[PDB]
Symmetry: D3
Subunit: 329 residues, 6 copies
C-alpha cells in the first residue's frame, strides 16, 4: 500500500510528456516526501514550476550525460524514474552519437549514480522500438534496457532494484501522429500525409503508462522488462478522427521506420511470462541472487507462454476504432 509514502523520487527527463504526467500523478495520489525533476531546459522547468507550483517539488537543471551532476542530484533519492532521452527517430539517424550519448551513456551514468547514492528502486522507460530494432534510436534503447537489467547483477551494501517498462505509441504524445492531424487542420490542412497501407502500431494513453510504471514499482523484484497488454490500430482508421473530410496524400515510409512493431521478440518467448494484462520479459543472464519472476510483489501469478510466441502489433487481440481514439483523444 502506497510505497511512495514519504519517499523522495527523482525523474530524469521530468519536463516531458511522461514527466509532467508522472509528477502530476505522484503529487496528487501519494505522500511522497519530495519529487525531483532532473532535466536540462530552463525554459520548460521555469514553466513547469509555475504550473506545478508545489513545495514538494525540486528542480535540478542537469544533463544525464554528466555523472557528477547526477551523483549530486540522486543524493538521498529513494526511487528513480528514468525518462530522459532523444527519441525523434529520424533526427537520431542524422545525429547518431548525440542519441548514443544521451540514451546509452545517460543510462550508464544514472545506474552508476543510483548505486552510489543507494537508491531503492529504479525504473527506466523503454520502447517497442527496442525490440529487433532497425533504427539507431531503438538500438540505443536496447542498449539502455540491457544496462538496467544487468545493473541488478551487482552487490552493494544496499540492494538497488533496476527494472524496465516498455510499451508502444503514446496516443497523442508531444510530437506524435494525433497531435499533428490537429495542428494541420488548424492551419488549413491542404492534405494530411500518410504512409504504407499496412502500417500497424500498439496504442496506449499517457495516463495508462504512468499508472503502469507506478504499479510496476509495487510488484517489481528488479530485472524485469514489464510489458503491458495494449491494443493496436492500423494507420488507416487513424485517418478518420482529426480530418475525415480532408484528403491524405501517401508518403509511403520515413527514415528508419518499421511496418509493424515488436514488443516481445519471438527469440525471447522462453523468457516471457504472462499475466492477466501484462507480461514480464525475464533477464537473459542469471543474477547471483536469483528472484522468482512467476510471483510478483503483488502476489499475481504468471504462467510461461507458447514456445513459439511473438507479441507483435501486426496481429494482437485488442484493437481500436477511430471513435475510441476520439473518445480517448
Amino acid at each position: 500500500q502506497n510505497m511512495l509514502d514519504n519517499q523522495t523520487i527523482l525523474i530524469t527527463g521530468g519536463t516531458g510528456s511522461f514527466g509532467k504526467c508522472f509528477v502530476r500523478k505522484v503529487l496528487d495520489t501519494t505522500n511522497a516526501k519530495k519529487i525531483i525533476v532532473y532535466s536540462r531546459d530552463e525554459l520548460k522547468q521555469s514553466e513547469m514550476a509555475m504550473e506545478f507550483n508545489d513545495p514538494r517539488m525540486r528542480f535540478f537543471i542537469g544533463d544525464v550525460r554528466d555523472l557528477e551532476r547526477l551523483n549530486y542530484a540522486l543524493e538521498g533519492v529513494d526511487i528513480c524514474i528514468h525518462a530522459a532521452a532523444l527519441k525523434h527517430v529520424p533526427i537520431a539517424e542524422y545525429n547518431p552519437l548525440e542519441c548514443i550519448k544521451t540514451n546509452i551513456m545517460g543510462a550508464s551514468n544514472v545506474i552508476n549514480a543510483c548505486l552510489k547514492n543507494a537508491i531503492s528502486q529504479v525504473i527506466a522507460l523503454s520502447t517497442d522500438k527496442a525490440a529487433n530494432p532497425i533504427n539507431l534510436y531503438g538500438a540505443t534503447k536496447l542498449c539502455s534496457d540491457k544496462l538496467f537489467v544487468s545493473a541488478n547483477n551487482f552487490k552493494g551494501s544496499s540492494q538497488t532494484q533496476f527494472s524496465v517498462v516498455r510499451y508502444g505509441n503514446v496516443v497523442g504524445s508531444r510530437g506524435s501522429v494525433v497531435p499533428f492531424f490537429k495542428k494541420l487542420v488548424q492551419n488549413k490542412a491542404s492534405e494530411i500525409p500518410i504512409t504504407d497501407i499496412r502500417m500497424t502500431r500498439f496504442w496506449i494513453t499517457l495516463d495508462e503508462g504512468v499508472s503502469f510504471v507506478l504499479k510496476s514499482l509495487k510488484r517489481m523484484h528488479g530485472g524485469e522488462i514489464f510489458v503491458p497488454k495494449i491494443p493496436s490500430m492500423k494507420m488507416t482508421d487513424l485517418a478518420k478522427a482529426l480530418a475525415p473530410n480532408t484528403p491524405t496524400k501517401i508518403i509511403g515510409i520515413r527514415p528508419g521506420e518499421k511496418l509493424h512493431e515488436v514488443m516481445i521478440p519471438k527469440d525471447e518467448s522462453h523468457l516471457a511470462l504472462e499475466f492477466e494484462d501484462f507480461f514480464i520479459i525475464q533477464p537473459t543472464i542469471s543474477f547471483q541472487t536469483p528472484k522468482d519472476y512467476t510471483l510478483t510483489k503483488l502476489h499475481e501469478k504468471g504462467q510461461k507462454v507458447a514456445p513459439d510466441f511473438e507479441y507483435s502489433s501486426h496481429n494482437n487481440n485488442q484493437w481500436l476504432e477511430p471513435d475510441d481514439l476520439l473518445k480517448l483523444l
Copy 2:
C-alpha cells in the same frame, strides 16, 4: 587502389586480422600495413610470424581517442575489426562492449576524419540486424555511426562503409573448431542448442576478399552484404561427426534460432547484385550518391517488396561434404 597506400586495421591481431594482413602483403602493393591492438602477447607473436618490413605494430586501444589520432597519422585506408563479440560475455559486461564497440567506433571515425583517411570499412555482423543481444545492438549503433559519418565535410572527404556477414567457419573460438577439441577430447557427446538453429557461413578468406572488393566498390555509406550459404546447425555436427550423440543443452543468453542479415523492413533500401547486396543509407547526404552503380560499374537492382535475407529462408546451403572442404 591499395598501391603504395598505408593501411591500418584495428583489432589487427584477430582472426580476420591476421588473415587480412596476410592477404594484403601477398597480393597488394600496400606500402605499409599497421596493426593496432591492445595485447603485447599476440603482437609479439604476430610480428614473429609476419617478419616483414611493411608491417608495423601499434599497441593501442580504440577507447583511446588520442592514441588513435597518433596511429592513424598518414594512413590512407582503415579497416575497423576491433570489437568484443562474445555474445554471452557482452550480456554480463554490457558497458564494456558499449565502450569498445560503440565508443570505439566513434573514436576511430574521429581520428580518421582528423588524419584525412581516404576510405574506412568497418566490420559489422548479422547479429546487428533486428538484434536481440547487447553485442548486436552495439554493432547496430556502430554501423549507424559509420554510415552517418559520411555527412561530414571539409577540405578533405572520407568514405565510410560497412561490411556485414554471418558466422566465420572456424573463427577464433567458434563452434566448428570446438567440435574438434571435443573429438580430440575423446568425448562422444555433441552439445547442441536447437535442431532448428541456422546460420550463414562464410570463410575467413572469403570475408577478407569481400572487404578488399568493397574498397573498390564503395562510394561511402553502404553496408555491403555478401551472398553466402546457410546451414542447419544439425548438419554442422553431422558433417563434423557422422557418429556421436547430440545432447540438447538448450539456448545461450542472447541466441537467435535464425540470424537475419537484411531485415524485411529494409527491403526498400536494398539493391541486388551478382554476388552481393548493398543496403542503402536511410538518411540523405549533402553529396548524394547513386548506389545502383558501384565504382566498378556494377549495376544493382531493387528487390521484391517483402524481401528479407535470413538464414532460415536461404536459397543456398552448405553441404556437409562441401563444408568439410572448407576446413
Copy 3:
C-alpha cells in the same frame, strides 16, 4: 560580407536564434546557416517552419568540445547565442550556468580557432556590467574570454567580438509577453517588483540587425553596445494595462533596480558613435587595433570622464504608445 559564407549559430532554436536565421535567409546570400542546439523537439519544429535548403541542424551541446569541432568544420562566421539566462534559476544551479555560459564560451572559441572561422560574435548582456547575479558574472567571464581570444595567432587569424544590449521586448518568456497571459488569464492584478525598476529595451529585430552590422564593423576585440531606450517598469504595465491593479511582489533573487551597460569605471575604454558604443579591450594585443575607425570607416570619439550608460540615467525613453508599436 556574408555572401556565399557558412554561418553557425549556437543556441539557434532560441528567440534571437529563430529571428537571426530568418533575417539571414531573407536578406543575405549566406550559402549555409547551421543551427547548433540540444533539443530535438525545437529543432524538428524549426526545420518545419524553415523548410529551406540552406538550413542545416546539428544536435549538440556547447559543453561538448569534440562535437563543436565537428560542427564548426568549414564555417566562416559563428554567432554565439547559446546560454542559460534565467537569472533566478542560475542562482540555484550556478555550476550549470557556469558550465554552459563559461565553459561553453571556452569550447566555442577553441573549436572556432581550430576550424579557422573568420569572425565570431558572442551575445553578451547588460547584466554582465558591474554584475550582481551569477548569470551576469558568467556572461562577464564569457565576454572576457572572447575579447582575450583575439591574442591567439597562427597560420590563420580569427576575429572575436561581443554584442551587448538590454531586455528584448517580448523575448522567450520575458515580462511583456507575460503581461499578456495575465490579461488573457482574465486576471486583474499586475505583479510589480519596484516602482523604480528600469531597463533598456531593444527589439528582437533590432538586436539582430545590430549583430549583422557589427560583423561589418569589427576589427575583433570590441564589445558593441547599441544606443537603446530605457523605460520605467511602471509604464510597461501602464502601457500594457491602462486599467488594472499593481500588486508589489517585491524583488526576485538577483535583480537590480537599474541595469548598467557601460560601467563608470570603463568610460575611458568607451568610444562613442552615431548609433553605437564600442567598449575597447582593457588589454593590449600582439596586433594592435584602432577602434576609432570601424571597418565601415565610422569615426568614434571618447566620452566624458564620468560617463556611464545606465538605464536609470538614459536620455532616451520608450513611450507607452511607441511601445505598443513594437508589439
Copy 4:
C-alpha cells in the same frame, strides 16, 4: 570556546600570505589535531615546512583544479579554508581561462570534495573585487562566492556549512602597493608611479583577516558572506610613508582597475544585516532548511540596514593617515 580543538583543518593555497599567517595563528592559538596545507609549488612547501617545522603540519602537493586529488586530501578533514586562487588582475585579463579554471572550477571541486568527505565547516575567501566587478578576476570570485553560498542548498547525511569572507586590500600583501614602495626605494627609486588622484581603497592587516576568518567559523550558520568593518585610505596619503622624499609619476589607471571598491552593493542592501563591527550579506536564494542570520552562533544580534545602503570605499566612516600605515606597516 576553541572549536578547532582536536579538529583537522585543510587550507588550499596554504603557502600564500594568508595561508602562512592562518596556519601560524592556528598552530599557536588552537589545539587543532592536524593542519593540512594544500597547494602546488614544491619550492614554497619545501620552504614552509622548514619555517613551520611542526609535527601537526601535513603538506599535500595538489591543485584545486584536480577533483581526485582534492577528494583524497579532504579525506577526514573537519574544516576547510579555501584560499587558493589566481589574483593578479591584469595577469588574469591576459589569462582568462586559467583564472576561471583555478577560481571557478577550483571552487567547484573543493565544494564537491568537501561534501564527499563530510567536512563540517568551509570558508572560502572572497574579495571586494567580487562586488559589481569589472575585471575577470573579480568575476571569477563572484562566481566562486555564489557556488559556496549555493553549496548550502544541499542535503547529505551530515550537514556541511559553507560560508564566505570578503574584505578589501591587505596592507602590504605579497605583491601589493606597500611592499613596492620599499622594493623601489631600495634600488634607487628614480620615481614611484601612481594613478588617479581620486583612487580610494578599503584597508586591513593580514592578521586582522586571519582573526576575522577564525572568528567567522565560531558564529557562522552557513551561507553567509561575512564583511568586516574596515577603514579606507586615498592612494595619495599612501605616498608619504615609504618615499615621501621621492617624486611619484602619474600613470593614471591600469588594466581592469576601479576608482573605488564596493564591498556590499546597493542592490543587495536588503540582504545585508549589520553588527557592531561586521556585516552579513544573506543568501539571495532560499535554502530548504532556513537559518536565522540575525543571531550569530556568538549570540551577536544584527539589525537590517537603510533600504538604500551602499558600503563603498569612496566614502566610509573610518580612514587612515600615512602614520597609522607605518605604525602598522
Copy 5:
C-alpha cells in the same frame, strides 16, 4: 591460519600466467568466498571460465586504466592482487605511453578504487627490473611500487594495507626463455639465439611466486617490498636442457636489457631487513602510523644487513644446473 577464509579476492591481470596459477592455488587451498578475475580479453576469460569452471569465480571484463570500472569491481572486495601489466620490455620501448598508462596509471587507479571500497590488503607485483632500471618497463614498475608503498600513508575509516612482492625471472613464463627453446626445437630449430656470455639472472617457479605472494599476505603490515631468496643461473647453462644437440648463434644483447639484475639496490641496504629466506625492503618515507618491520605477522624476526650490501644476480649464494631446470621445467 587461512585468512582468505570467506574473503572475496580480486586479481587484476587475472588471466595471465600468475593469475591462472594464483586463482588455481586459492581455489584449491582456501575457503575464499569468491575470486574475481579482472582483465580485458574476452577470449582468455572465455577460455579460463571453462578450465576453471568454478561457482566461486567471477569474471569482470575491465581495464586497469578505467577507474570507474575498477571502482565497480572492487566493490565489496577484501583482498586485491594486482598482476595486470605490460611487460614485454622491447615492446614497451616502442610503446612508452601505453606501458605508462597500464603500469603507472593502472597502479594509480587500483589504489584509488581499493581505498574507496575499503579493501583490507593489497599486494601489487613488482619485478627485479624495477631496481636501478634502465628500460622504460622497469621504470613503470618502480613508479608502481612507489605508489603502492606511499598509498599506506593514507588515513581512511578502515586501514587498507598496501604491499609489493618482487622476484626475478619466472622459469618458463608465458613468453620467456625456456618456453622458446621448446617452440624452436619443435619447428626444426636451425639454431637457438643467445646473447652475452656473462648474462646472469635470478630464477623461481610460478608456483613459488604464488605461494610467496600468498604468504606475504599472512605476514604483511603494509608498506613492504617483499623479496624472496631465490637462485641464479648464467644464460649458458640454460643452453643445455631444451636443445643441447642444436647450436646457439650469438645475438649479444637486446633493446633495454641488462647483463645482471638487481633485486635490492646497494643504496637501499639500510632499509633492507633479512630473514631466513626472504628480505623486506622498508619504505624510504615514514608513515604517520609507523609499523615495526623487524617482526612479521608470522612472528618471524629479522636483522638488518651489511651497511654495504647489494642483492644482485651476478653473484648470489644459490645457483642452478641445467638438470634442476629440467627437473623443474
Copy 6:
C-alpha cells in the same frame, strides 16, 4: 639556427628558466621567447626583470594538453624544463610527480607534434640513470617518451632530444646556496649526509650553453650528456666553510651515495666526443640516424665495453678553490 625563431620553454620561471631566457635574448636573434609556467607571482616579477618586447608569458600547466596546444601555436623550438624535482617531496607525493613529469612530458610531445614544432629538447637528470627514487623514475619515463617520440611521422617531422647533467651549483634551493643561509644564520654546524657522498657539478650557465649547443647538434633521439666534474660532498663543505663542524645527519628519503649519468649497461649505446656524450636510442627508427656525426660534423666514437660515467669514478674533480670561482 635560432634566428627569427619562436622559442617556448615550459617551466620558464625556474632557475634554468630565467637563465636560459637571459642567454637567448642577449645572444640569439630569437624573434620570440615564450615562458609557460603556472605561478602568477613569479611571472609578474619575471616580466618586470625582463621588460623586453620579444618576451611573452603564458600562465599554464603542462598537465593541461589543451592549454599547451594553444601556447605552442607557431613555435619552432621547445625547451622542456618544467618538473617537480624535490626528491623527498616526490617520495610523499608520487602521483603529483608522475602527473607533472610523466604526463607533463606526454602532453608537451603531443602539442609539439600537433603544432609542428621543429625541435624539442627536454631536460633530464643524473637521477634518471639506474634510478632509485620516484623522481628519477619519472624522469626516466620522460626521457623515454621523448626519445620514442621521434618515430612519429606525418606531413611534418619534429626532432626530440634530451639533455642530461648533474647537480646545478647554487640552483633554486639546493645545497651550496643553503651552505650560505647557514653561514648567515650565524650557525656553526654543517649538516652532512655521508663522507662518501659524491655528485657531478655543472653551472647554470654551462647547462644553458649545452642545451643551445645540442639544438645545433641534434638529429633527434639523442640523450646529450656534458662531461662535467665530480666533487666529494666533503669538499663542498670544506671549500664553503674551511672552519665549522660537520654533524652527520645521515641520508634523506631516496638519496644515492653516487649518481650515475651513463649506466654500465648502456656503454654500448654511448658515443664519445670532445666535450660530450650521446647515449643512442635503444630502439630503431623508421628513418635511421647516424649518431657518430652530429650536425656540426663532430665525429664520435664508441667507449670501452665496461664503461660507466659515474660521480664516484670520474677523472675530473672540482677544486674547492675552483669551486669558489663558480659562485
